[PDB]
Design a protein around this motif. Structure first.
Motif, mmCIF file in Angstrom:
data_model
loop_
_atom_site.group_PDB
_atom_site.id
_atom_site.type_symbol
_atom_site.label_atom_id
_atom_site.label_comp_id
_atom_site.label_asym_id
_atom_site.label_seq_id
_atom_site.Cartn_x
_atom_site.Cartn_y
_atom_site.Cartn_z
ATOM 1 N N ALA A 195 0.814 -1.225 -0.514
ATOM 2 C CA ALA A 195 0.218 0.056 0.232
ATOM 3 C C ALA A 195 0.350 1.178 0.031
ATOM 4 C CB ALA A 195 -0.400 -0.147 1.334
ATOM 5 N N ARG A 196 2.251 1.462 0.222
ATOM 6 C CA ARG A 196 2.848 2.691 0.046
ATOM 7 C C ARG A 196 4.296 1.718 -0.930
ATOM 8 N NH1 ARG A 196 2.951 0.509 5.545
ATOM 9 N NH2 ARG A 196 5.121 0.358 6.103
ATOM 10 N N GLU A 235 4.207 -3.996 3.168
ATOM 11 C CA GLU A 235 4.224 -2.595 2.664
ATOM 12 C C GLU A 235 3.448 -2.297 1.184
ATOM 13 O OE1 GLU A 235 7.449 -0.721 4.341
ATOM 14 O OE2 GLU A 235 8.973 -2.056 3.838
#
Length: 10
Positions: free
Chosen positions: A2-3, A10
């Motif tokens: 997600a980032r 992550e």
């Protein structure tokens, strides 16, 4: 994931 980061949570 997600980032970006190393993948995985992550």
């Amino acid at each position: 994931a997600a980032r970006x980061x190393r993948x995985x949570p992550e």
